[PDB]
Design a protein around this ligand. Sequence first.
Ligand SMILES: [Mg+2]
Length: 347
Amino acid sequence: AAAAGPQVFDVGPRYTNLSYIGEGAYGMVCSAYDNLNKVRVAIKKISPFEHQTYCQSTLREIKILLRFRHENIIGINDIIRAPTIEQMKDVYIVQDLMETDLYKLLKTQHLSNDHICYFLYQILRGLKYIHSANVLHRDLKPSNLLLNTTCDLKICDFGLARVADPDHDHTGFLTEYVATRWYRAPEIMLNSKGYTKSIDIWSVGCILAEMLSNRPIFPGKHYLDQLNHILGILGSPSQEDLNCIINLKARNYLLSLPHKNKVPWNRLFPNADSKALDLLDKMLTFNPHKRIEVEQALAHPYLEQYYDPSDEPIAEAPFKFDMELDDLPKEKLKELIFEETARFQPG
Ligand SMILES: [Mg+2]
């Protein structure tokens, strides 16, 4: 009994006065007035129950976001659903209302170096917590970074997040992958399933570049073009880095390419702070084993104004899934979603 651009947005009497914000992957996002806490909030309507992939993403995000507690990671304030599994068609996730996201901001606004530095700090601060829980976000990009009017930044969208599993990271050349193309590390196309923390650091490096110029640094038009873009800037990998790739097919593909020299960062970003470019270089390192880790990045001179490891908290314990969600049907995932959201029922 409350409508927005039809569909139904029925968020009990607690939340009223809706306004469209945008379209999520599984439904509408609206702002609403929270009559209890007397502030406006964001509410995401999720109708995932007709697809198993949607159910997986929904369950991951709920389980992770309820477990995590950090200033730079969006929290779940409330979840609204029907009182029984039979009656539950949609789920509504309530969060703090953020003003915008970095994707929307970068369309029209140039960032000062101070804004770049602070936003990077907050990304990495949140990421340290996520990594400390042994979790990989796996889809870091501007539209998954929420911003408010006072420049607070919160990472959102944990629908592709997994527990880190470096021992099972290896795969064949040109193995298909799910997360957003432009932000994919080179090894994803070569030999990696994206089960190590280094894949997130690559994504942050792409985000830093994009903050510096207001355009994606590696805008590949398709799967293999993405690697072409990356190599066009970094240049040909060294022999040492090629020897680290044991995958014959991936190694021979790289050996087949003409030599390319590195494009210097200060040619690409002539107005950028030199320390920012030095950190960028270390995040956008081809060899994932040599790539900077989150705690080192925080300690980099670029971020010296903000660095304080005692104020960069970690998770109280590693995160673990009870069961593997990929092997679970539509219906069992619905069941788990119901149980995970039970704490918010008057009940
Ligand atoms: Mg998103």
